Design an enzyme around this catalytic site. Structure first.
Site, PDB file in Angstrom:
ATOM      1  N   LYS A   1      29.631 -27.689  39.830  1.00 41.08           N
ATOM      2  CA  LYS A   1      29.888 -28.976  39.115  1.00 41.08           C
ATOM      3  C   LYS A   1      29.689 -29.024  37.054  1.00 41.08           C
ATOM      4  O   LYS A   1      30.543 -28.078  37.318  1.00 41.08           O
ATOM      5  CB  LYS A   1      28.333 -29.352  39.174  1.00 41.08           C
ATOM      6  CG  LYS A   1      27.811 -31.254  38.577  1.00 41.08           C
ATOM      7  CD  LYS A   1      26.464 -31.544  39.056  1.00 41.08           C
ATOM      8  CE  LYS A   1      26.731 -31.711  40.530  1.00 41.08           C
ATOM      9  NZ  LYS A   1      26.957 -33.150  41.218  1.00 41.08           N
TER      10      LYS A   1
ATOM     11  N   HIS B   1       2.419 -18.403  28.105  1.00 39.04           N
ATOM     12  CA  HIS B   1       3.401 -19.475  29.729  1.00 39.04           C
ATOM     13  C   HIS B   1       4.522 -18.168  30.283  1.00 39.04           C
ATOM     14  O   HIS B   1       5.017 -18.789  31.096  1.00 39.04           O
ATOM     15  CB  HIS B   1       4.222 -20.251  28.450  1.00 39.04           C
ATOM     16  CG  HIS B   1       5.052 -19.853  27.440  1.00 39.04           C
ATOM     17  ND1 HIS B   1       4.679 -19.268  26.241  1.00 39.04           N
ATOM     18  CD2 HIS B   1       6.736 -19.610  27.655  1.00 39.04           C
ATOM     19  CE1 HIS B   1       6.022 -18.640  25.920  1.00 39.04           C
ATOM     20  NE2 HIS B   1       6.666 -18.838  26.737  1.00 39.04           N
TER      21      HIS B   1
ATOM     22  N   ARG C   1      30.876 -13.574  17.701  1.00 39.30           N
ATOM     23  CA  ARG C   1      31.549 -12.553  16.943  1.00 39.30           C
ATOM     24  C   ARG C   1      30.608 -11.267  17.567  1.00 39.30           C
ATOM     25  O   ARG C   1      31.022 -10.714  17.748  1.00 39.30           O
ATOM     26  CB  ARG C   1      30.972 -12.540  15.026  1.00 39.30           C
ATOM     27  CG  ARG C   1      31.537 -11.458  14.449  1.00 39.30           C
ATOM     28  CD  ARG C   1      31.841 -11.406  12.765  1.00 39.30           C
ATOM     29  NE  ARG C   1      32.074 -10.380  12.166  1.00 39.30           N
ATOM     30  CZ  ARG C   1      32.931  -9.553  11.902  1.00 39.30           C
ATOM     31  NH1 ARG C   1      34.321  -9.878  12.989  1.00 39.30           N
ATOM     32  NH2 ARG C   1      33.392  -8.849  12.015  1.00 39.30           N
TER      33      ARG C   1
END
Ligand SMILES: Nc1nc2c(ncn2[C@@H]2O[C@H](COP(=O)(O)OP(=O)(O)OP(=O)(O)O)[C@@H](O)[C@H]2O)c(=O)[nH]1
Ligand SMILES: Nc1nc2c(ncn2[C@@H]2O[C@H](COP(=O)(O)OP(=O)(O)OP(=O)(O)O)[C@@H](O)[C@H]2O)c(=O)[nH]1
Ligand SMILES: Nc1nc2c(ncn2[C@@H]2O[C@H](COP(=O)(O)OP(=O)(O)OP(=O)(O)O)[C@@H](O)[C@H]2O)c(=O)[nH]1
Ligand SMILES: Nc1nc2c(ncn2[C@@H]2O[C@H](COP(=O)(O)OP(=O)(O)OP(=O)(O)O)[C@@H](O)[C@H]2O)c(=O)[nH]1
Ligand SMILES: Nc1ncnc2c1ncn2[C@H]1C[C@H](O)[C@@H](COP(=O)(O)OP(=O)(O)OP(=O)(O)O)O1
Ligand SMILES: Nc1ncnc2c1ncn2[C@H]1C[C@H](O)[C@@H](COP(=O)(O)OP(=O)(O)OP(=O)(O)O)O1
Ligand SMILES: Nc1ncnc2c1ncn2[C@H]1C[C@H](O)[C@@H](COP(=O)(O)OP(=O)(O)OP(=O)(O)O)O1
Ligand SMILES: Nc1ncnc2c1ncn2[C@H]1C[C@H](O)[C@@H](COP(=O)(O)OP(=O)(O)OP(=O)(O)O)O1
Ligand SMILES: Nc1ccn([C@H]2C[C@H](O)[C@@H](COP(=O)(O)OP(=O)(O)OP(=O)(O)O)O2)c(=O)n1
Ligand SMILES: [Fe+3]
Ligand SMILES: [Fe+3]
Ligand SMILES: [Fe+3]
Ligand SMILES: [Fe+3]
Ligand SMILES: [Mg+2]
Ligand SMILES: [Mg+2]
Ligand SMILES: [Mg+2]
Ligand SMILES: [Mg+2]
Ligand SMILES: [Mg+2]
Ligand SMILES: [Mg+2]
Ligand SMILES: [Mg+2]
Ligand SMILES: [Mg+2]
Lengths: 422, 458, 458, 422
Positions: B3, B120, B213
């Site tokens: 996809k 979390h 970079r």
């Protein structure tokens, strides 16, 4: 005092104290929770912006254009009162938007209450009047030099449409009635703001620079009347802008997945109607499709209904919750096909409800193993110069995605499409 | 069945079919309704982006970086399974965020249930477990060549810490794969490379750091008898500028006074609205807002919707929260009284936060004030600014290599680069507000604050 | 009548007829054949811009700034005469630049003519007088309300400076007009607002500074009887950010080592080519490359064309310079040996650069090497990086004002901002290059360099 | 070793050692002093780029495209030799341009040497041959696996034109000749780089995105010839590309002042010729016009000659010096009639120098007391699909600017228009 607000598209925007006082109200703050593209979020993950910034930018652009025209030609006698009026008119031009922006007034109302003709500009003007009445803005307008009796009507004429039928201002200030909304050709700040914001957020390249157009702005006397125009060398830029808007529409606004998602969301909302109650003044309980008649009950009608249905626990919202979950699992209704523009006779606003019934009623000549009912077909309808075009697209979608249903559903299209002379 | 997705920041993001299958689940689609910046949308009107795009970008960046590293040195023995596991670990690293992103775990849980510590990352681990268990993904993982028994543990250790080489996911000669998504030895990982660009594009600020970079000059060498990512000796200033840009963003956008006060008011409203909002979870049980962390089904239905759920309620029991939310709508926020010079002696611990308002209320201004203030009408907030290592120098742990002998690891001190770098790497800011919004209260609060600040010699 | 010109960094610039009259002259059009970065075009292929557009942009920025300042505060009595004077002064500030911009006046003149002081500002002023006197522009200036006898002196003063209150161009109540084109007090002007954007657009290095926001918050506070432009008290971090970005650009692009060595070789080629190039000046005199700074008529014919005149010549007298430029054209550059970390001494003066090769050559290493190096095969470059005021804090000479009383100016120390600001603002750098290219010679040179650095305690 | 070079458009680029070796030669370095837009610099100050970065970008784009195409289909048997050859060809395609890169071979040569045909592809191929012969690169080419005799012929056939006339490769690898220079419809890396760089520099925005085209790049054997077959849903993208090209051409390249300055400086060069002398092999001396017959003399031909004429001191170049002084003082020629567009009949290439004499031979039916010789009139000549148009404009310019000459000049123009049936 003067308030500076950031905006990624434009630079730093200054806000007059009257505009600051207007913004800080529940009626305008309600726009924080309505999406610019509505159902286009689920197909472009990077497009998650609301109407708050759109309204702010439109107001800023209208003010800038009016100031430029006034300064470049001092004999037109444009006063700061006109500037404030145009800015306020451009700030409140989208207050009437329902959930998912255009989807509500484009697809839900006709399938719910066919006997009422409603466009969101009338909602915008009613909401503006309710805001002004409730928040006591008129004393401030009188304080700052604006006359409510004339200015309110001028703003109303600026938002909605009407030998000069307008009564807000004399006929010598005609150009002021096109800066925010243009009913003749379709060029104003509003389309510019859509183009800029959509191109920036969605990730598409742009071609039109409004500043160049602003530079060559003159108020001529074309058509035996005052009127905005463009320089004779701006043909290329104008055609580039037209191509840009057409490309934006084709690429984003009419995507298959966006339209199908909008269709299933509308079906879920319709099926969930008559079970959600929104309380207005006096405790009156309104439905989703009847809340427009009361603005305080319409204020609480935002994109939160989607989540209210999604997380609902009562058994009365079983099917709507099921359809929302179907959307969530990315198992959408199968695309069936498309028909060339209807052509000749045009499909009226109140014909949407009957269309699915006709398709089912059609009897294809070939034999169909599975019989289809009137609830198995959902149809989507899409509607498409001083230098001194429309068509309707109809799509049909089927809820069932099994191989047998699609083949049976296909026979209905060929029989019905030919019969109706598309 | 490969996809494509469109992202304004990056280009076209390519997805393996397994990733697409994992994306389409309620536990992941829940992220569409959580604000990235939380309360920052009420100051920067242009910042209304969600965690869905951030997770997608982080996964894409991790995949691209691992691919580039593998192609640079084909002797590392990097396989398809490694890349897929890294991408999956990079896609499900923030599933544990509650409403308004960081506000929840930074201000509510420490105030609502102070008996436990919760972050979390643990929530992300639990939600990943629940997703894999309930959505039937193990057979597909087996089909696509992965081994769930070890891959699940590897992903978990990728997301969260180790819980003598402790890692039990991969052998010791694969230690460079554990510093791509979340890097513990230092902050160089593909999370900042995503959210820096996203926040700079949306807020309306330019970015000074470039990651292509850096990816062009990345190598793995034999630091300390292990294989870890190695940088080039001609890029020390670039890393210092990365950290300086991070600090500038934190000081300009994430630590705005108005955003912080709005978040504080929202936390107060949530606290006053607790014990009355019931959320259904597993087995028909009812959980509160603070207790919903103990069940995944109940936690899934916890999103930003609570703001509107409380705001538009009509029950008599939710008046105390609706008043504050309406005050937010009318923009009658708390007033900023003053601020104290940053740090110098000591950093205030967490346990001392609750005593600040009482301490400031106890100050006695020299000049008598016609208005008397209470101890419950003062708000004090503490902000910590650092480089991510709490007074340590993060670059000290970065290994550099030269071009004459690329397969050798060297370390560069601070004095060998420049003399214009910061001397310190940590400080604290203390803000004091007030609730009453009349001029006399502001004057009295200013007197109280100046007296208190002078008392402790800041 | 107003002409509109298109530039990429800005939008569209409107030019007053007087400005257009001044522009279309040989002296001003000369700027089309000078490259801004000079030697940086051989390291960054995309930096091929000139000084003409830089001057145009600076003029536009100065005009916009003065217009905004006049609009906001009406009690200053700013007329169009002052606006035109400032625009002219900003349009003619880089008139005296030589070939390759800063390389000429940084290297060639101090070496070619070591008995005189010459900075490009004086050359620009002299070119201004020559232009005005030769093209007969005084009548045109008179036609548009200007008084040349005073406006010309004001324009001169705005470029170089003074030649109690020393200025004479304007009265003492218009002092803020001298801090728009080139500021001497601290160094905040429009030059380091235009070339920032232009260089960061052409080179490819993204920029962080934002000047429109600063313009939006600019006022005059009347500090110490001296009407001065004064900023807002919340913009300290932004000023430190702009200075840090300037330092980053200097460390990154302008002070590249390869660019520096290429510039050194070009300067050597020019010096060896001197005495053989003749330029005809006023009255029929012939001037060398070095002496052309004395007759502006001859100086108007001195541009970047000298490089190609030397390169394509065929006279045998110019064999050395042609050979050196040809080596530049084959990338047979001088090699890089080493770099003494920032010296921990007071400083090395300008008049002490000559002895460095002699002292590095004379160092006797502990180990013995067969290869011998002469004192003429060592090249030493001293590079300076600071904030632009010789180890003085620039933000100490900037006046701020608060919100409540915008008419009152205050000052802010370094401690009241943050503890992460740099300790020092000045330093030095030293690079050594070896002409010999064979491995033995460069190894011997590296040994000599390390022993010399150890000798002097670097 | 590998070399990384920073570009302001395409980003960091990696260079193969062979290409780095090729770059560091005088023949390739002379491109640093030739401007891309030529005389259009004096109209847009922001267009001051050269052909060096243009060639670098073309080579990089060709390498990326060929690599992606080979990777996406492992059945094509694409080898590293093909990639290196394509990159080398793309690095040596604009190697033959002289001063200003379009004035020379577009206008100057026909006026001075009308008996010889000379395009810039011939110059590029000749310069490439001289470079490879004189820089001793053949052993280096063999060191990395490239066969000199065959690869050089392949590169030559890539730069310039040849049932299979191509000799480098068999008919199997036919698609390799449509990457760097496409002549059937005009899609290639060179034009992509043109558009991107020009839009970036001049200050315009474009709606084309080449990354999408690269992603959807595939080759299908259309009617027994391998081509670059794109998808079927990017007709909009192709339309966007063509619209961008047309807008760029109508905006930047065809500016009137650009062309008037172009013809002015071309006439200055023509008057300055026969007095500028350049040296080649063996001490032989050549002029500007005949330098094209000597590669070593050509290598020393860049825009330096403009300043050489301007800064000259010999009396024999007085007229050219005065002309360039007029250029500097903006004492431009007169736009004196803008002759009508094509009429099917097309002017032959070698008849350009005769047209100025024709205009002076007209006999308008107006009282023209003044006499104007052909020496005071100047004319300008302008120019203008697998899924899995030409016209000439004539402009007239007058050397004199006096109002008396304006009336007389126009009369011949209209009469000459009538005489030529334009
Ligand atoms: N007033 C207002 N500000 C907004 C809004 N959205 C974003 N902002 C920004 O948030 C900032 C908040 O400023 P204020 O509301 O004035 O609060 P304050 O600056 O702390 O105190 P005052 O300026 O005295 O009111 C403004 O400067 C705006 O730039 C909005 O809807 N209303
Ligand atoms: N699967 C998926 N696609 C998304 C999501 N968000 C945006 N998209 C985009 O929306 C497009 C629609 O995906 P699908 O539902 O599979 O539509 P489709 O590809 O035509 O249907 P199929 O061919 O059967 O896969 C995808 O190509 C994505 O680029 C998401 O959350 N999940
Ligand atoms: N005069 C002038 N114009 C320039 C210069 N650089 C770019 N231009 C642009 O080039 C355009 C052409 O200049 P002109 O030859 O004066 O043509 P014009 O603009 O129509 O002006 P007139 O011929 O006098 O009517 C102008 O509009 C400028 O915007 C320059 O250095 N000098
Ligand atoms: N070779 C080469 N490099 C260029 C050119 N233009 C810009 N550059 C850049 O300038 C840098 C110079 O590097 P080198 O030529 O290799 O010189 P060096 O890095 O000092 O040391 P060496 O690698 O041994 O030559 C390169 O890395 C390029 O990125 C060019 O035309 N040729
Ligand atoms: N440095 C910055 N760069 C970009 N946007 C900024 C910056 N600082 C603030 N903004 C945002 C915040 C607001 O949306 C707007 C400017 O607000 P800001 O200047 O912070 O006003 P404020 O309300 O905090 O303070 P005050 O009224 O005292 O000036 O732009
Ligand atoms: N031409 C385009 N330009 C920009 N964005 C596009 C364009 N076409 C599609 N997108 C967006 C839409 C989606 O967010 C993503 C790709 O979707 P799209 O290509 O339309 O897939 P699709 O689901 O319609 O078809 P398919 O499964 O055949 O790929 O990029
Ligand atoms: N399409 C374009 N968009 C933006 N800038 C353009 C465009 N075409 C040209 N420009 C440049 C050219 C000049 O720099 C500036 C506008 O000049 P332009 O309007 O062409 O003036 P001119 O000298 O040709 O004619 P005139 O005197 O009639 O205005 O913008
Ligand atoms: N910080 C930077 N960001 C972007 N481009 C840069 C930066 N520094 C240099 N460049 C440019 C310079 C060259 O054009 C290209 C690569 O240069 P660079 O990596 O410095 O090579 P070099 O020859 O100086 O070093 P070396 O041979 O030691 O690797 O990128
Ligand atoms: N004090 C705050 C307030 C909000 N944000 C927001 C801004 C970013 O968009 C997001 C960062 O998301 P992550 O969780 O991936 O980054 P973290 O900062 O939480 O992890 P790390 O330890 O790497 O910094 O958090 C923040 O970083 N810190
Ligand atoms: Fe709108
Ligand atoms: Fe994250
Ligand atoms: Fe300058
Ligand atoms: Fe080309
Ligand atoms: Mg609208
Ligand atoms: Mg598909
Ligand atoms: Mg996280
Ligand atoms: Mg404020
Ligand atoms: Mg013009
Ligand atoms: Mg200067
Ligand atoms: Mg290098
Ligand atoms: Mg060509």
């Amino acid at each position: 005092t003067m308030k500076v607000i950031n905006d990624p598209i434009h630079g730093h925007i200054e806000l007059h104290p009257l505009l600051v006082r207007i913004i800080d109200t529940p009626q305008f703050q309600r726009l924080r929770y309505i999406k610019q593209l509505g159902g286009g979020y689920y197909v472009f993950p990077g497009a998650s912006h609301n109407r708050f910034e759109h309204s702010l930018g439109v107001g800023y652009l209208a003010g800038c254009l009016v100031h430029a025209l006034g300064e470049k030609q001092p004999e037109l006698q444009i006063s700061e009162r006109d500037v404030l009026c145009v800015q306020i008119a451009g700030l409140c031009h989208d207050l009437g938007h329902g959930p998912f922006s255009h989807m509500f007034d484009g697809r839900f109302i006709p399938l719910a209450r066919p006997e009422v003709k409603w466009t969101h500009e009338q909602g915008s003007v009613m909401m503006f009047e309710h805001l002004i009445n409730s928040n006591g803005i008129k004393p401030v307008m009188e304080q700052y030099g604006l006359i409510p009796e004339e200015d309110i009507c001028f703003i109303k004429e600026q938002i909605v449409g009407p030998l000069w039928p307008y009564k807000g201002r004399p006929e010598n200030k005609s150009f002021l009635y096109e800066i925010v909304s243009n009913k003749r050709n379709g060029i104003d700040v509003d389309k510019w703001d859509y183009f800029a914001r959509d191109c920036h957020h969605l990730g598409i390249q742009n071609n039109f620079d409004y500043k160049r157009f602003i530079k060559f702005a003159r108020v001529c006397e074309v058509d035996n009347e005052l009127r905005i125009c463009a320089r004779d060398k701006e043909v290329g830029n104008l055609y580039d802008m037209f191509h840009t808007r057409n490309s934006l529409h084709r690429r984003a606004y009419q995507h298959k997945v966006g339209n199908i998602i909008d269709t299933m969301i509308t079906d879920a909302f319709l099926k969930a109607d008559d079970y959600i109650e929104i309380t207005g003044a006096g405790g009156k309980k309104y439905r989703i499709s009847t809340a427009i008649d009361d603005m305080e009950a319409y204020t609480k009608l935002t994109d939160n209904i989607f989540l209210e249905i999604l997380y609902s626990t009562d058994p009365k919202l079983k099917d709507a919750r099921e359809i929302l979950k179907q959307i969530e699992y990315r198992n959408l209704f199968k695309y069936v096909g498309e028909t060339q523009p209807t052509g000749q006779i045009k499909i009226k606003r109140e014909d949407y409800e009957s269309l699915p019934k006709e398709v089912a009623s059609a009897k294809p000549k070939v034999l169909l193993d599975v019989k289809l009912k009137a609830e198995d077909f959902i149809v989507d309808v899409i509607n498409m110069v001083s230098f001194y075009f429309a068509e309707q697209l109809i799509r049909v979608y089927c809820k069932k995605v099994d191989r047998k249903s699609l083949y049976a559903a296909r026979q209905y299209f060929v029989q019905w499409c030919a019969d109706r002379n598309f």
